[PDB]
Design a protein around this ligand. Structure first.
Ligand SMILES: CN1Cc2ccccc2NC1=O
Length: 124
């Protein structure tokens, strides 16, 4: 079964807009999104559709780029580091659930390298 997806808004959490967060949406996320290996990460893992019935028995902090994108669009984050942590959670979940060498892991590894390339330098 699938749990509810992660929240993309929270009225009691303070919002913020920063040059770095704008950049994470306009450049980092929106560029990764177009990568040929982006598709598995563009929405929450669907344990039913993908036939991964144990996914959420194993992964307790789900994250995906669809969620991140919505969060950025909503100014959900306080700062860039909070957003970067979501990306890292997404990649880490993939390495936890799957094994080295798996096609999905090769896709995550590629995206993570591109992600690190693009956040190496952020605006000030
Ligand atoms: C995050 N995904 C996405 C996915 C899509 C299709 C088949 C397998 C997976 N495994 C994952 O861990």
């Amino acid at each position: 079964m699938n749990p509810p997806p992660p929240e993309t808004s929270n009225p009691n959490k303070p919002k913020r807009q920063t040059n770095q967060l704008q950049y994470l949406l306009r450049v980092v996320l929106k560029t990764l999104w177009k990568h040929q290996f982006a598709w598995p990460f563009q929405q929450p893992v669907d344990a039913v559709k993908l036939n991964l019935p144990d996914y959420y028995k194993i992964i307790k902090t789900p994250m995906d780029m669809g969620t991140i994108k919505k969060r950025l669009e909503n100014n959900y984050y306080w700062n860039a580091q909070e957003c970067i942590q979501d990306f890292n959670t997404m990649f880490t979940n993939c390495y936890i659930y799957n094994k080295p060498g798996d096609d999905i892991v090769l896709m995550a590894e590629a995206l993570e390298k591109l992600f690190l390339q693009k956040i190496n330098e952020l605006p000030t």
